[PDB]
Ligand binder design. Sequence first.
Ligand code: MG
Ligand code: MG
Ligand code: MG
Ligand code: MG
Ligand code: MG
Ligand code: MG
Ligand code: MG
Ligand code: MG
Ligand code: MG
Ligand code: MG
Ligand code: MG
Ligand code: MG
Ligand code: MG
Ligand code: MG
Ligand code: MG
Ligand code: MG
Ligand code: MG
Ligand code: MG
Ligand code: MG
Ligand code: MG
Ligand code: MG
Ligand code: MG
Ligand code: MG
Ligand code: MG
Ligand code: MG
Ligand code: MG
Ligand code: MG
Ligand code: MG
Ligand code: MG
Ligand code: MG
Lengths: 151, 96, 106, 127, 98, 206
Amino acid sequence: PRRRVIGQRKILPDPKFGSELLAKFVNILMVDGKKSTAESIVYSALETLAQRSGKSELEAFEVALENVRPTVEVKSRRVGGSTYQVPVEVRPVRRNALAMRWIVEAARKRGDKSMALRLANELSDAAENKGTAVKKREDVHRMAEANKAFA
Amino acid sequence: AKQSMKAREVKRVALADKYFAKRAELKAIISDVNARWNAVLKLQTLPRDSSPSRQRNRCRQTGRPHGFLRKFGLSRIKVREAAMRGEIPGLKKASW
Amino acid sequence: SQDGTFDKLTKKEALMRTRELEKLENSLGGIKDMGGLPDALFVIDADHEHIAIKEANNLGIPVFAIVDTNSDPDGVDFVIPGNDDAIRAVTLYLGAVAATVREGRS
Amino acid sequence: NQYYGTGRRKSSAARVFIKPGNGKIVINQRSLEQYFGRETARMVVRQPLELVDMVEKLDLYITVKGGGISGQAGAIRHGITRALMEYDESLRSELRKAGFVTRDARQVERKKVGLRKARRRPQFSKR
Amino acid sequence: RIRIRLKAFDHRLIDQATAEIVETAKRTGAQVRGPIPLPTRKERFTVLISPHVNKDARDQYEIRTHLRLVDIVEPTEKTVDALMRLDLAAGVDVQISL
Amino acid sequence: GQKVHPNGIRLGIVKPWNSTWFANTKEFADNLDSDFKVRQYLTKELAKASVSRIVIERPAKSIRVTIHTARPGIVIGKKGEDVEKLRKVVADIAGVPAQINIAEVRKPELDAKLVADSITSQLERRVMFRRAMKRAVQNAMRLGAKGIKVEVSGRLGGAEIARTEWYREGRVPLHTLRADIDYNTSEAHTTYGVIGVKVWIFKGEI
RNA sequence: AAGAACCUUACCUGGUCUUGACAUCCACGGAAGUUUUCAGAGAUGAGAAUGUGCCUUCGGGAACCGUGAGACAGGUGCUGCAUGGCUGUCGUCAGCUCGUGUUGUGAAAUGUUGGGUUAAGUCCCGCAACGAGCGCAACCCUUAUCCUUUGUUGCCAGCGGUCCGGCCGGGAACUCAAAGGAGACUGCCAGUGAUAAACUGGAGGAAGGUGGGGAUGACGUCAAGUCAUCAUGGCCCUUACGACCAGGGCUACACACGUGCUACAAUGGCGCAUACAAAGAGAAGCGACCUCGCGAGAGCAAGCGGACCUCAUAAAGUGCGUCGUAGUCCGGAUUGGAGUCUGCAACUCGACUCCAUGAAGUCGGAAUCGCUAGUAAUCGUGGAUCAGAAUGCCACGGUGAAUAC
Ligand SMILES: [Mg+2]
Ligand SMILES: [Mg+2]
Ligand SMILES: [Mg+2]
Ligand SMILES: [Mg+2]
Ligand SMILES: [Mg+2]
Ligand SMILES: [Mg+2]
Ligand SMILES: [Mg+2]
Ligand SMILES: [Mg+2]
Ligand SMILES: [Mg+2]
Ligand SMILES: [Mg+2]
Ligand SMILES: [Mg+2]
Ligand SMILES: [Mg+2]
Ligand SMILES: [Mg+2]
Ligand SMILES: [Mg+2]
Ligand SMILES: [Mg+2]
Ligand SMILES: [Mg+2]
Ligand SMILES: [Mg+2]
Ligand SMILES: [Mg+2]
Ligand SMILES: [Mg+2]
Ligand SMILES: [Mg+2]
Ligand SMILES: [Mg+2]
Ligand SMILES: [Mg+2]
Ligand SMILES: [Mg+2]
Ligand SMILES: [Mg+2]
Ligand SMILES: [Mg+2]
Ligand SMILES: [Mg+2]
Ligand SMILES: [Mg+2]
Ligand SMILES: [Mg+2]
Ligand SMILES: [Mg+2]
Ligand SMILES: [Mg+2]
């Protein structure tokens, strides 16, 4: 990254719903190279969520993401000789990347029986924005606006 | 490498060929399921230096015990010296 | 380039050969057929060719130079004061010298 | 008549045959679902035929060996695209645009002396 | 009927031997199924290059054995004999058996 | 020690092998030991005959042995008086019938082994090492040999601290595999200890 | 150290030898060799039968074995601050130099600096510099596409019937095997750029900008490592610092650190069924099949110096069922009993098998490491060493990410 601006590696779409966004989500949830296991967990959670909240799989998924997507974050740019936390805008791609990572982290921390059940509960709460992942977004937003003095 | 150590190796090889491979039947023909007496087992008063599993397989040129290669009969470093000068047919640095 | 191996091998090195050939021709052209040291030197500008003047003095070669008001004499055995930047003036100088030198041993 | 394509993907090599018949697909004397058509890489085999819509318009007879599920499925996809073009070169353009024409040359990297595997280096400590 | 398989450490020499074997058989016989490459054997060796310690410093060598197969399907008699006394081998191993 | 062996790295490209026999694993080790035994006896016996290299090959349960020498007359001797004696001993050591061939070396001062041992002999005779190196480089370039290069090491002139003192002339492209390099080494046994000598001789590009 | 039970092995305790365990020379005596007994831990002594194989103007000779004296042999004994050779390292970093010329009284400088550019002292332009060398790049191996050739032990698209097995007629297509060729060169287009070098993008193409990986390590630095692989100057021992033997030790154990393996579980454990690899080794060897044993294994015994036979069923994965968050059907340490095999010999001190037992451990303080793609992570397979003895090392493939503003 010092010299060479680089391109991007394309990813296949989900085999069931054919969406790049869902393909990235299973990759983030995938542990240890076991994609099939991750695919099973995700699909089980989504069909459960669709049953809970009606709607559909993808649209219900998006509703959860929109409540956890950050908009601004802090970033150390100690330039003057002292460390400051300058808030900065988040790129559209980095938005959902952070959202998906937070949701997975929250679900793993959740103490239910199955991972599929954990994930369904976590992003079902995120649909109403009461979950731990939503809490982390609030902390990030709140910390950023506190340091609003810098820009 | 301590010429006495190489002397032990040659004596071990001579004894092994002299006694065993002909009295190896002693532990093969009899120490089996004949139907026994143990007289054959007690008839292991042989020099004890004739056992083939008692030779160290040293390098042919220098005679060091470690880093031996069966195919060439030389230690690792004598192999490298001969390989670089030719000597070993068909052997060359490998890349893949 | 003419009777040698120029079409042989890839085009690029042939292009390189031409590029360096024209570089050698440009830098040291007419001088190629001389095959020795000079015995006289006619110089257009003393200050703009002081390197040449210095070399001639070191080797003890006579130097004839056209020196302008800003030039530095005393490195030239035969100094010819006059303009050295005008095309008409330099053409007159070279024409006269060429005419005078065209009479060799006859 | 029959049209052919080879296909290859990370130690797998396929052998595909195309006939202008039904839409059935046979792999190593087995149905697509019987082989891997319901597990991972189910749809990559169809990907090429989705485009150049000819799903039901062509019959496929295939034999593959080497590699694993993903490697073999990738080999099948490469073989199909090479065959289709043999049955209608006009498709190349959009097949190449989809990226199926290129053979993916991404072999596994050999492990080096002094490293644990390929690039993983043993743990280091100063003091 | 009678098979010839040749082993050597370099392909430049094995190919010359096979060409000699094939041409002589054709001259004194007929047919000949032709040389068959058969897989090459690559034996690898890895040895430490320092006389002491320095475990990570080592060289890798290999010996590459090349193989060929001829197979004359029906000796014309004037063939078999000539298959003998035609060694001209200086590093290529020939086994005459069927 | 950080440079690859120039001869070994070119074995399959330009330089040939010094042994050209085939063997299975059963007898591969025995042949190597036999080749070592014959070379060490032959090199010891022909110390004064200026032997460049010994090439061994084993066709049909025999041994050929070719000797590249710069003074073939001495190696052969009167008619075959000396060569036959060598053949008898070589056959005895190898345990198989032995042929023997002699190849003369034109231009001995373009062969690194002969150059290296020439310097070694002078050093043991207490010749100034610098003069020996200068002479070898000078007369090597005098006959083609676009790239002579020499190097000594260890207790030069009887000094208490070892020193290398190399010297080159021409071009010696050690990184070009296509180049024909003729590297070799030798060793002196002066009264103060050991002195190593290395020689690189570069020739046509292919 | 690519593999310490004995050996290896040097180290220790005892028991032993002195021209010697190892080599040349001299004289003497005797073929060599083989089967047995006693004492001894053994080294070694004491014996007895057996055999007596090639030469000869015979103070005698050839391989071999014993005796005696000497020159000698022997040393893993010290010095890597006397050395050769080999190796690590800065660092695969882009630098390091020379001839001639010129400048300076001189140490030195210039070139090698400057404007652009590159992965690069890479290239162009300028320039008191003009050229050259070692380095960079290329030539080498391997991988990604295609073509010709050859076609068994490899293959089976089209034809025949088949025990439904490429099995057997057959076919040379295809995969493959391995020899020889083609291909990639900023080569072509557009734009920028001093019009130069070059750069950005596009087309085509399997591959695009040194496509991926490997080998390749400049002048030198660290009196870096190695006298124990080997060689070697000097020094030192010589009935001993040399040599032989048995047993022990290198495996100890209040402790501290480095590198690893297995876990703390439900993206999982267990039971049943089932799918898909690559690369290697094999004759004092690999060892089908069948029978026996719960098992490690045992007996009999094909084939294979091996595209043929054997090692040799890949595992993660996928379908069912169960466990339901517990120190548990997690974890497997430790220990008791009973065994297999290798080996003269498993006490110190081997591997594995069966039954039982069922520690710590519930994600780890300060701190700290690896990795930019078929990579990390995880899952199996093979080989060297080797009688036996890998969680180490060296290789092979399966699944396969996240992120570089
Ligand atoms: Mg010694
Ligand atoms: Mg052993
Ligand atoms: Mg094999
Ligand atoms: Mg190196
Ligand atoms: Mg002992
Ligand atoms: Mg011991
Ligand atoms: Mg003692
Ligand atoms: Mg040192
Ligand atoms: Mg001066
Ligand atoms: Mg410099
Ligand atoms: Mg300078
Ligand atoms: Mg510059
Ligand atoms: Mg350069
Ligand atoms: Mg310049
Ligand atoms: Mg049929
Ligand atoms: Mg492009
Ligand atoms: Mg290079
Ligand atoms: Mg030191
Ligand atoms: Mg070091
Ligand atoms: Mg030390
Ligand atoms: Mg020491
Ligand atoms: Mg130890
Ligand atoms: Mg093995
Ligand atoms: Mg358990
Ligand atoms: Mg506890
Ligand atoms: Mg728990
Ligand atoms: Mg990197
Ligand atoms: Mg593993
Ligand atoms: Mg083993
Ligand atoms: Mg792997």
